[PDB]
Subunit: 252 residues, 6 copies
Amino acid sequence: HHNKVRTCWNEGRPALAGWLQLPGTLHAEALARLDYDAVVIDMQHSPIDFGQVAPMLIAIELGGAEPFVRTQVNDPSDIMKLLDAGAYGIIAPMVNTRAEAQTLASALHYSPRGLRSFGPRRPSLRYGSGYLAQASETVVGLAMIETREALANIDEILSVDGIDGVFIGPTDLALDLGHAPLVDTEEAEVVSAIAHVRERAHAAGKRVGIFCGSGGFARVKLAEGFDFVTAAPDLAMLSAAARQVIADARAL
Amino acid sequence: HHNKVRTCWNEGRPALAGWLQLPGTLHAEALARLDYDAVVIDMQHSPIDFGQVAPMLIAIELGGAEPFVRTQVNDPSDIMKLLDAGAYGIIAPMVNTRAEAQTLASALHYSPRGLRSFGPRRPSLRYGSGYLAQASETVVGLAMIETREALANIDEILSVDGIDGVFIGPTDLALDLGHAPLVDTEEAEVVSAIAHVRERAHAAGKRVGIFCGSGGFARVKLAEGFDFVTAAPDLAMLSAAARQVIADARAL
Amino acid sequence: HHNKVRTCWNEGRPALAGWLQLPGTLHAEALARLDYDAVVIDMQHSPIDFGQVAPMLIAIELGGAEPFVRTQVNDPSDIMKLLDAGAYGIIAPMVNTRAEAQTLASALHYSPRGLRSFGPRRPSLRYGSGYLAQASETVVGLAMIETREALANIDEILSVDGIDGVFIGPTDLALDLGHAPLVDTEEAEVVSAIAHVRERAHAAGKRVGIFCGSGGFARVKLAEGFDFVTAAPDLAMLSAAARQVIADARAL
Amino acid sequence: HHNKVRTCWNEGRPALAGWLQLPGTLHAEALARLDYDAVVIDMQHSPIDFGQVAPMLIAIELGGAEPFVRTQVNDPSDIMKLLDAGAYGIIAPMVNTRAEAQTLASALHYSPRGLRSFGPRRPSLRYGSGYLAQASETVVGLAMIETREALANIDEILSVDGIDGVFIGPTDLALDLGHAPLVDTEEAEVVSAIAHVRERAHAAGKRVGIFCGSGGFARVKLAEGFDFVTAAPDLAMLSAAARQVIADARAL
Amino acid sequence: HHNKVRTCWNEGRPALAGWLQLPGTLHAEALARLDYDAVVIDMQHSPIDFGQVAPMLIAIELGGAEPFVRTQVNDPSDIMKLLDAGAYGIIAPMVNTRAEAQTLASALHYSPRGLRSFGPRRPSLRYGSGYLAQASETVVGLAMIETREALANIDEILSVDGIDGVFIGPTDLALDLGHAPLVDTEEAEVVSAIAHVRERAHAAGKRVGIFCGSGGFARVKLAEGFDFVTAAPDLAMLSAAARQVIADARAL
Amino acid sequence: HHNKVRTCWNEGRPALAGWLQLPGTLHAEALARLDYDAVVIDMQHSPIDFGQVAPMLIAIELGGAEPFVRTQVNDPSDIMKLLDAGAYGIIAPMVNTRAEAQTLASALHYSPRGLRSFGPRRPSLRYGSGYLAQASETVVGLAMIETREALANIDEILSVDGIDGVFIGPTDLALDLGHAPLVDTEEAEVVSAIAHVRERAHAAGKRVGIFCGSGGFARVKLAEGFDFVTAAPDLAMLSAAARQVIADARAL
Ligand SMILES: [Br-]
Ligand SMILES: [Br-]
Ligand SMILES: [Br-]
Ligand SMILES: [Br-]
Ligand SMILES: [Br-]
Ligand SMILES: [Br-]
Ligand SMILES: [Br-]
Ligand SMILES: [Br-]
Ligand SMILES: [Br-]
Ligand SMILES: [Br-]
Ligand SMILES: [Br-]
Ligand SMILES: [Br-]
Ligand SMILES: [K+]
Ligand SMILES: [K+]
Ligand SMILES: [K+]
Ligand SMILES: [K+]
Ligand SMILES: [K+]
Ligand SMILES: [K+]
Ligand SMILES: [K+]
Ligand SMILES: [K+]
Ligand SMILES: [K+]
Ligand SMILES: [K+]
Ligand SMILES: [K+]
Ligand SMILES: [K+]
Ligand SMILES: [Mg+2]
Ligand SMILES: [Mg+2]
Ligand SMILES: [Mg+2]
Ligand SMILES: [Mg+2]
Ligand SMILES: [Mg+2]
Ligand SMILES: [Mg+2]
Ligand code: NA
Ligand code: NA
């Protein structure tokens, strides 16, 4: 009866989350039972459509992590249907302006705070009769910062009341700045922009997150004060592990 | 226009294969593009049903590995439908007697050698008009040895003409012998039984394979002369990788 | 070769419809064979995506009710794809302005009346060669009225030619007015607003519908003159029935 | 970390279970959150195949009831794959002889007690490292008694060690005795046979269950001492509720 | 309220049926609306599993043809689940002996005639309260004759009461006789065997069918007196049509 | 490591493509292995949703044709998710203005040329490490011209840099001009408009394509200089073939 990520924050610690681009419930449950506070299902850069995300949300909740979704797009009705299917965290890609951040916020709150349509199929089962009064706190929302334009507008994006903060998309950000879309990059201009976004989010009293490709980079981001760190995509981790097993098996 | 595992054998080398318990096509293709000769899809100890295996076979072939299936049971009609869907290797669990091995063989060959029903939807597309004359060589078949009874009958199982050899199921074998079902075990009685099965398979001029849980154990099995080694399940590798990322991320 | 709801209206009677939030074809067919003129599939507050709605439309038609869909959003291309899959009634949520009602209408009619794209896969099978000339009459369209803004604009919404009328969303309406989102509510301000919408729809010569949570409330709405009444969601009815069976079974 | 039905029995009370013939996770979770100790998913007289049962098992567990399956057939490998997918109760239809009951038992226990193949994907996640030592107690197994032949063999069926008892299929039983396949029947010969099966099960120190079509009949069966009572199928309850809503809505 | 194939026979004419190896409902409905009396869904030499056949049965019935299934295997519980999903014709492959034909018959009739388990989800919806009394006539059953052994046993197979007759599998038959598995073959030994099976079926007062690859061969088979002729597989017809469109498009 | 349609163009020849409205992988692979340079999957006038298109893209690539998609709508995030799933050609319906064409172009190119979000799951597997530098050339994009408005704006649409040209939707075009939506029409006003669009595309140095319903019309369009011709929809070809088989089978 609490959003586990908001509980982390309320108790003074950051949240660490998993990241899934592979559809299915078995690895979703297995990873949720690890020491992840949340598991993000990626519906943008994956083949995961709504039909496949729906059972994954159930499996993550059963495993003991908060189910999050990184949506394909910042679309209110898409987001609302995910909320009613038991997504309790929303990360919306490519939020570039205050207006787009306001569009995200509008989907996450019932009237009068937002315009979310009422029919909370799975949240009513989880939270019971008192859901409506607490509905806003049960959901975490982050706008993604992935472009030069979003950087230009970062302070105005952070002024939006109905979202908890921002989540950096570091490979899109590097690419829009004219650099290789490398995860966990050392490119100075990108590193400086990421630091800037974190600094402005905290100056605004908001939360800031970042996508990480490795556990070591995630540790550094937590030390730098990021509130929400993801590490690392299931497909990337699986591919790297398989490569190493093969190398070990085929070595002389 | 060749079964990649049979090509390994024909050219004097063993085959290394992947092992999938997670449904879906994206990791199947990704792992098939690694230096695996084959990828086995587990339909016994997984939630992978026929509807989910079918596109995975396509994805593995596109990635450049031979699609194999470890079936739920040694059932001829199940096996035939997988063959016609483009499974080119069959590993049948719990083959305990010569008769059961003969049942496996019967499904893998058209008349007069076997009783496989003719309607090769996907193999005809892959191999073209000359498929029938070469159909038997396009498929690899292994009977699993997983019980004290299968050990008792190993020589008679190895005498069956229509199968390429046997594949050890080491956790079921350890359990039936009264030991912990530990993968890559050091338990002497199990280690001795595995060695015995390999020795009898090669005395019979047949192939022998084994399921491995690690790249290091797989390397040792290849050095011991196993013809077909799998390493390691996608879910196990992914879970271990995620555990390590979390440990690294949460370390001081 | 007639839309059953339009036939009700043409013959001077209202239509009663079912309401499905559970995916699947078996209960869809079973409920369609009851004395429902139509069955509405809810794609907003449910886990029903396009892949799951498509066979349900077939099952409802076979059962003998008109297949309707309450869409996730008022989006023209979404609506068109449902029409071509054999949805013959469209209820679009959150229609708040005349322009949005015009957007709904545009999707329901071929040129010159609307901009519906031509490729009527399933309607051509149902209606045969003369489909195009009769296509508009085969589809029923209702804009949902669920907000204070929609109330403010009700007369302008009702002036839109290409829609049959409006459908009240009473729990969203109550919530936007600052009241509990209770179905079949007695809250005076909500009751008055619902009556007002009905009165203006009929003053405009248009149809008006309402979502009901019980058979008794639906009877009263029919007596008040509503043209299209739904009662009641499959999940709600099933949950209530199960609760009662358990209470009866566990009673002393 | 306990099978909820076995906990009922261990604490001196019978278990009441739901019964699902409709695929999908939403009503499965909703009904599991009611005062059902278990929810049985029917894979015999339904369109529920393995691909659809798998997420339902997750949803039932999350809702707080023990997931049970009534299988299509008494087949060991089918049953094992369901166990590894997190079915913790198995009801096998048409068990007519002691040998068939022994076949059921064989699938529910690891060696040496049975021949269940080891690879417990979801039970290992639920129960953790100590699963193997407790695996047998985590699963409940009932053989169905549905024919004159099963009646003839009831004492020998009840002598089988690896099953918890029997579950009466009352409509098949009535039909094989030459009577209408009416649920909750009053036909004396059927009523007498049901009573006889219960009496012999308890004389054997075993559990006995029965399928019920109503809460009132279920109450009587509990009073008669049945250990496991199901009431009532989702589709039947939903259809009856819809019929009544329509009757109420269309009444003058 | 009649099986359309049995109606053909009762009115003195043969039945012509379609044959589907491609999953999906749209072409199933489209072909059922043509002058086919039935449409057979092939679950043996196709990727069509139960989850995909279920909506296809609905679509065929809506289109106006009798839904038939050629099963993967002659298995009673598989067949029963298809019957309860609304398959009204069963063609079982590889029926080689009288006993196997008796196994087929057992699944198609309730007690006392057979052992079919009672729970007719979709047939009860189609036929209503009087279903049980007429259930046997609503289903057509054919045993496939595809081997030298089935030829050897043809008279004993035809003596089985609970099946309507036999259905020749001509490519498997040619292959088992040592000839190319060519559809619509002219190979004298195969042609003679097919004629023999037809002659013995009619001498027995039973029905005989055959799989055809072309409309011209089907016409000849109807002239020869076959009672049930299929022509031709969706995939084969589609592939041939596409080849011709390409040839026409690319011609000078 | 080349887009097959762009290779046609680079080598001085047009491309011929298939057109699929039926979901599934088997006919997709079979048709891709014919002498089609590409196969277009129709997600507008079909029941093919994202979950069903994803494996079809794999099957088309394996068969040896370039996978194309005609999307439901010109939506950037939809298009991007298809690109990352291995759609290498995009045909967007109802592009009526230069701005809408600019929206299409924006989705097909990474920064700085467009705003495509980076996460190319399947293209990175196909093309390897050098994908980013060549990404734009790997994708073909065509805006559809289907309305009087698109005709009015054809020169401005053709001036858009990030698209390869236009694709005529001839049945929607005929309908918007007030004529029957007949494929391969002879209606002079439609024929003249189609010719005009081709002439302006080539005057602009751009590519032009057209949807065809027959191989003979496609041959004429290729002779007229169209760069991209599709012929003909799987469902239409299959339906026509089945009609002819039935006519041949039922003829005296
Ligand atoms: Br952990
Ligand atoms: Br990464
Ligand atoms: Br590698
Ligand atoms: Br392992
Ligand atoms: Br009724
Ligand atoms: Br309600
Ligand atoms: Br309750
Ligand atoms: Br019942
Ligand atoms: Br016809
Ligand atoms: Br054929
Ligand atoms: Br060709
Ligand atoms: Br066409
Ligand atoms: K956790
Ligand atoms: K503010
Ligand atoms: K490989
Ligand atoms: K031998
Ligand atoms: K009805
Ligand atoms: K007007
Ligand atoms: K419960
Ligand atoms: K005993
Ligand atoms: K017909
Ligand atoms: K007889
Ligand atoms: K090709
Ligand atoms: K330009
Ligand atoms: Mg990004
Ligand atoms: Mg094993
Ligand atoms: Mg609403
Ligand atoms: Mg029964
Ligand atoms: Mg055959
Ligand atoms: Mg068009
Ligand atoms: Na959308
Ligand atoms: Na089976």
